[PDB]
């Protein structure tokens, strides 16, 4: 079992991860949390690579991809395999969103791509953590992150644009308190 | 003006590269010379984790894609925007060489990835630098550098499949001797 979470900075994306985790492993179920970039070693030190350095958009991609490509094959494959349920914090929408719909690069060819990295490994569910560009940058503003507006707001409608055409998506309301999107989230879930 | 040196390890590729090098300097052309993996600090680290790392195909092929990438806009276009000579110690046919030929991949995709990296930047012309298997070995066995004959066999076919199919290709004889080869190649780039 494969669950993807896709959104934006300040989507509490990773909170949600984390505690449908816990969650999860309570019930009974052997489980794993993995973020992207990062999850490996080698996954951890792009990411470091992809936070500290100036990078053109096709070199930050391939990186993306490196690290996913990595994951996929030291981690989620045999988690698969031996039916652990696979939680991820961020996936394959994300790199559309922010490479191709932010950043200007041809989607088809980031899917493509995304495609090679998985193994065509693909979510049994992806919960997009949708919210108003406005609300994350507030959230962020208290952890003194600080993100542009303009960019965000492209990427926001990839995603938004993701979840109608792409397979097995299911747009969750982040805006709202943590409790209340953690219920979202497990009613989303129902699926499986 | 762009000129690229290919071939398997112990070719002495590295060697005439910077042979060319020295001399198109001493014939006052402004000349650059840039390895790959490598030749921009972000491309040292990967290659690093390249030579590090127990990695499979596809991730090495994005991290080799990657450096290139990093290359191309850090160095080699404002290099060719300003008419140095830029010269590559390993470019887009190795990458075909060692991960398609070599290690399975499929070849028409890791073509239209170069052309991703390069953002369709091609070599003026390419230097094959030939040999065979088992003197590459030996010349590899005086550094105490050991490598897999029944790999490099393989990569060699694919190398000399290219230069047939591929644009600009001139194969070089690299088992001669040093002041021979690089006579060849001088010949080989009469534009002079």
Same mark, same amino acid.
């Given at each position: 079992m494969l669950i993807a979470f896709e959104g934006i900075d300040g989507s509490g994306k990773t909170t949600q991860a984390k505690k449908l985790y816990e969650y999860l492993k309570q019930k009974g179920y052997f489980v794993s949390l993995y973020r992207e970039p990062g999850g490996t070693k080698v996954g951890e030190v792009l990411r470091e690579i992809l936070l500290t350095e100036e990078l053109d958009e096709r070199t930050e991609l391939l990186l993306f991809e490196a690290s996913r490509s990595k994951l996929i094959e030291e981690k989620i494959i045999p988690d698969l395999k031996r039916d652990k349920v696979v939680i991820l914090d961020a996936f394959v929408l994300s790199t559309i969103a922010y490479q =191709?719909? =932010?950043? =200007?690069? !041809?989607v088809e060819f980031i899917k493509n791509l995304n495609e090679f990295a998985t193994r065509g490994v693909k979510p049994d569910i992806t919960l997009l953590l949708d919210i108003p560009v406005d609300i994350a940058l507030r959230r962020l503003k208290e952890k003194n992150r600080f993100e542009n507006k303009e960019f965000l707001e492209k990427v926001r409608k990839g995603f938004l644009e993701l979840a109608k055409e792409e397979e097995n998506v299911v747009v969750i !309301?982040?805006? =709202?308190?943590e409790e209340e999107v953690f219920k979202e989230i497990l009613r989303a879930l129902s699926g499986v």
């Open positions: =191709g719909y =932010g950043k =200007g690069l !041809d !309301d982040a805006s =709202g308190e």
